[PDB]
Structure 1
Amino acid sequence: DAEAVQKFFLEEIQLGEELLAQGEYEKGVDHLTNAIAVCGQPQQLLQVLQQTLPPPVFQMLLTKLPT
């Protein structure tokens, strides 16, 4: 499953951004909470997450990051 997760992680990477783009900020982070912390480079995702997301959205994902 974990190898399939490496493609399933990309799904929330694709699908979850519209959920934030549509306006579900909490649900988009909740959808992306299942995604993060399985990739090989969480730090490389983190340095762009500081600016890919809106500044209120990213810090809310930081709260959901260890959850």
Structure 2
Amino acid sequence: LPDLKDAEAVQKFFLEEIQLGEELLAQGEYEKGVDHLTNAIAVCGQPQQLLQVLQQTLPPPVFQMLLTKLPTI
């Protein structure tokens, strides 16, 4: 957890976490992938467009379990 780094982890650690999440959901162990997705969403700080974009790059059951695993209100 970078815990609000200024600029480095906002771009680097976010990319690392999002790509680990991508290969985790690709291999079938998508719960850790969703955890990495949430971490990268928090780290980047502008998840607005991704809120739609990452919404349309996954099967609907992944969307359902993600919205259950997204208590970011």
Specify if TM > 0.5: yes
Q: Point out the more displaced range, 50-59 or 19-28.
A: 50-59
- Structure 1 residue runs of 4 or more that deviate by more than 3 Å after TM superposition: none
- The offset of 1:40, in angstroms, is 3.7
The structure, 1 or 2, with the larger RCO (C-alpha pairs under 8 Å, 6+ apart) is 1
Percent identity, aligned pairs only, is 100
Deviations 1:11-64 (A, max 9, x none): 122121010010012121122222212324211101112210111112322222
Query: Is there any run of 5+ residues in structure 1 with no aligned partner, and where?
Result: none
Q: How many residues get paired?
A: 67
Query: Is there any run of 5+ residues in structure 2 with no aligned partner, and where?
Result: 1-5
1:49–1:58 Cα contact (<8 Å) kept: no
